[PDB]
Amino acid sequence: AIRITLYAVIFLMSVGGNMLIIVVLGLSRRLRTVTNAFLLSLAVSDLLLAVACMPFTLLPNLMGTFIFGTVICKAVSYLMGVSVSVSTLSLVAIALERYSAICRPLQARVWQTRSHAARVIVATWLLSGLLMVPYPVYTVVQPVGPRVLQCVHRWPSARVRQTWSVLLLLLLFFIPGVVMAVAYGLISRELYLGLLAKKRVVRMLLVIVVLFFLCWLPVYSANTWRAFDGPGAHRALSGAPISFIHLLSYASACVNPLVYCFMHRRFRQACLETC
């Protein structure tokens, strides 16, 4: 269908421009800061999302079978969990650190240093790994039918399955979503009050939150529906429908390079300096 063209465009942009961001933020060209360190971490997470998710989730839907093996399935499941958790927690980290940089700027002058940026980045990566240990512990590949492999997430008790599902839902979508929403609302409010074209980038601060919910809501809602409903949840969301839902999520990995980095002129100047 049309899914393959959109997956190809999103892969092309979200690998090309994202690796360009990783290259530019790699060598310090006087435009690397605390928030640029957080953008480097988010770019690594989104590149891992782009290279680990979309060809490896499209094919179980586009071909209907999992060509790869069980150890590949578990490693890609670890990549799934670590990349989604690091991407959401890194977005929240950029939100909270902008909330410290513009609201209460003296505390930013006190403790907003690159050492703190590295400490927070390492903390989110380690927490993501620890929380998503059960993701390759329990992604046992089961032959579904005669000769079809699907990488089912078998859990020992159902109660554990929906308990972990709601744990993921609150700890990666609900609480991170409300934290980033509150943080950028406070940034917009103190932009209006504390200090005009900044009122015009309040539009960008709005899209960073409402578009984030728009991109990331169907994935978590579908997975929660899978967790409780069980039998029959797959039949409504198999094929192209779910293969578009994840595309919205990967559109998130498509829009993160465009908004923080590519929109502003400073990164264009960094691009010119790199050349």
Binding site: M63, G64, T65, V144, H153, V219, G230, S238, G239, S243
Partner: peptide
């Protein structure tokens, strides 16, 4: 295509992300 379930009422999950 690729019906994650390929059967009826098997409750066989799919990749969350």
């Amino acid at each position: 295509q690729g019906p994650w379930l390929e059967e009826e009422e098997e409750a066989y999950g799919w990749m969350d992300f």
